[PDB]
Amino acid sequence: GSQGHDTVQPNFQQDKFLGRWYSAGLASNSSWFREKKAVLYMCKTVVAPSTEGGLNLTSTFLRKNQAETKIMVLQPAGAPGHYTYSSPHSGSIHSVSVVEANYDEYALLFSRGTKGPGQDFRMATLYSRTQTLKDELKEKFTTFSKAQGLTEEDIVFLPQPDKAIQE
């Protein structure tokens, strides 16, 4: 048994976090998004400084089940472990918080969206800057998931891109 609503650890450092990253772990607290989460395998993800003085995470996946190519702009909001990025939904509204993240080790972020519609969807992204399995990151994210009420069908850990003939 376990419990927990959510929590963010202040003192975030984009200096040793911003940049290119490798897919390792992901999650989602949505019911409609999960139906699509099962079709998003490994790929490339890089976050660079936005032209508007912020952050821009560009995603890209070629071949293998599905080919993706998008980019979001994250802008800090008050606390260090709190930002927002115009996502898909007409008015593009999103919010993200750093539940932990370590220096030169790994980066973890939780993206939740709260809009009038009442979506109240959440997400957990794990970025590996080494391409290795971290016990702390694995345990911190996996466990933190319980507090975030993750979804077994929403979790995505560096899926195998053995999708052939999907050019």
Ligand SMILES: CCCCC[C@H](O)/C=C/[C@@H]1[C@@H](C/C=C\CCCC(=O)O)[C@H]2CO[C@@H]1C2
């Ligand atoms: C609404 C916000 C969406 C943010 C998406 C995010 O910036 C992308 C993350 C990359 C994912 C693959 C990319 C796209 C999957 C799209 C699935 C879909 O068609 O809806 C996973 C592999 O590396 C990471 C985790």
